[PDB]
């Protein structure tokens, strides 16, 4: 067969150890989820806006007593209510408090005032994958694989907790000072052991069964991994067009084309992730995540060494010191106004 006796034994043991790890991690998550660190705004100096959204913004801050830098996501409670994202905001905080994994950003403090909600997390100084990818053009297959391996492990972890992620894309992946990935956004993540039905995500990364309004499951995240690996390795995503509706027609068609520089191993992996037939999609079969991890394209990947952060990264972002924001774009700076009247108190009582 493909493996001789020593390699088959090694792989079986590895796969059993993963099960042992996940069972412990699930116990730890559930204890934190059931029995969940405040601070206040004047504990921090505000330095610079690192990124913006419809909710509010993310700012670099420095914690006054300790001198540590953090990234502070500020959400305007009234805008959250208007954008129908109360449950999403409360869920994101609950997830971030409860998870623990080397590629998931660490929430350090949270708090709220009359106007806003605040989530203070580790600062990840290396910037968005998105920026680096557009700047360099494309990543080599080894460079793409190093990142892809981290997403595979992170999804193996999240899915073990019954969490579906649902908004993978380069925009949502940050690079830390050692060149490893950090996932920070959980705005569409949901606990789903069974199926779920909401239309959500980003057009280029939507799985066909989401577009087709079916009940769907964690396999949508493995489709999205396909999209990400393709985009990292090509420099552009597999399905694009001027308008979303034309993207969707490409996604559901069952057709994908590849650059001539893609390896055959890469193309085989992507045809198995970008599989419109759920009964054939990798990550959704009886062998689960192991179909992905044991694929030829990942044959050089030492999964434990990636988890331990002992692999030399392909790319180490520029870092001139704590507080360096050079790997982030410039955004228009708006004041943080706090109303003298409490807004939306009942909606956000659990935050």
């Amino acid at each position: 067969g493909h493996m001789g006796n020593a390699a088959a034994a090694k792989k079986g043991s590895e796969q059993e150890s993963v099960k042992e790890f996940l069972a412990k991690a699930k116990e730890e998550f559930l204890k934190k989820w059931e029995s969940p660190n405040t601070a206040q705004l004047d504990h921090f100096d505000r330095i610079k806006t690192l990124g913006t959204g419809s909710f509010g913004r993310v700012m670099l801050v420095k914690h006054k007593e300790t001198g540590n830098h953090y990234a502070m996501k500020i959400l305007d409670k009234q805008k959250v209510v208007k954008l129908k994202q109360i449950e999403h905001t409360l869920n994101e905080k609950r997830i971030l408090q409860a998870v623990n994994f080397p590629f998931l950003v660490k929430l350090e403090f949270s708090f709220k005032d009359n106007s806003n909600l605040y989530m203070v997390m580790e600062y990840v100084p290396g910037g968005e994958m998105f920026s680096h990818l557009r700047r360099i053009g494309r990543f080599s297959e080894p460079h793409a694989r190093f990142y892809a391996a981290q997403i595979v492990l992170t999804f193996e972890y999240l899915h073990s907790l019954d969490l579906i992620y649902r908004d993978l894309k380069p925009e949502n992946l940050l690079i830390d000072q050692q060149g490893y990935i950090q996932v920070t956004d959980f705005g569409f993540a949901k606990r789903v052991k069974g199926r779920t039905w909401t239309l959500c995500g980003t057009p280029e990364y939507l799985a066909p069964e989401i577009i087709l309004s079916k009940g769907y499951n964690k396999a949508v995240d493995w489709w999205a991994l396909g999209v990400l690996i393709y985009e990292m390795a090509a420099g552009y995503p597999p399905f694009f067009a001027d308008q979303p509706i034309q993207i969707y027609e490409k996604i559901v068609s069952g057709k994908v084309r590849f650059p001539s520089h893609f390896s055959s191993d890469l193309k085989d992996l992507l045809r198995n992730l970008l599989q419109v037939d759920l009964t054939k999609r990798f990550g959704n079969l009886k062998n689960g995540v192991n179909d992905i991890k044991n694929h030829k394209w990942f044959a050089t990947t030492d999964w434990i060494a990636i988890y331990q952060r002992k692999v030399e990264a392909p790319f180490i972002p520029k870092f001139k010191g704590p507080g360096d924001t050079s790997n982030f774009d410039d955004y228009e700076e708006e004041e943080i106004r706090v109303s003298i009247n409490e807004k939306c108190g009942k909606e956000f009582t659990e935050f």
Binding site: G187, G201, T202, A234, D242, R257
Partner: peptide, 18 residues
């Protein structure tokens, strides 16, 4: 090329969720 088609899509910047 396919890259040129990508540039023509106008979706080369940060993409919003739906």
């Amino acid at each position: 090329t396919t890259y040129a088609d990508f540039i023509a899509s106008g979706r080369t910047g940060r993409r919003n969720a739906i």
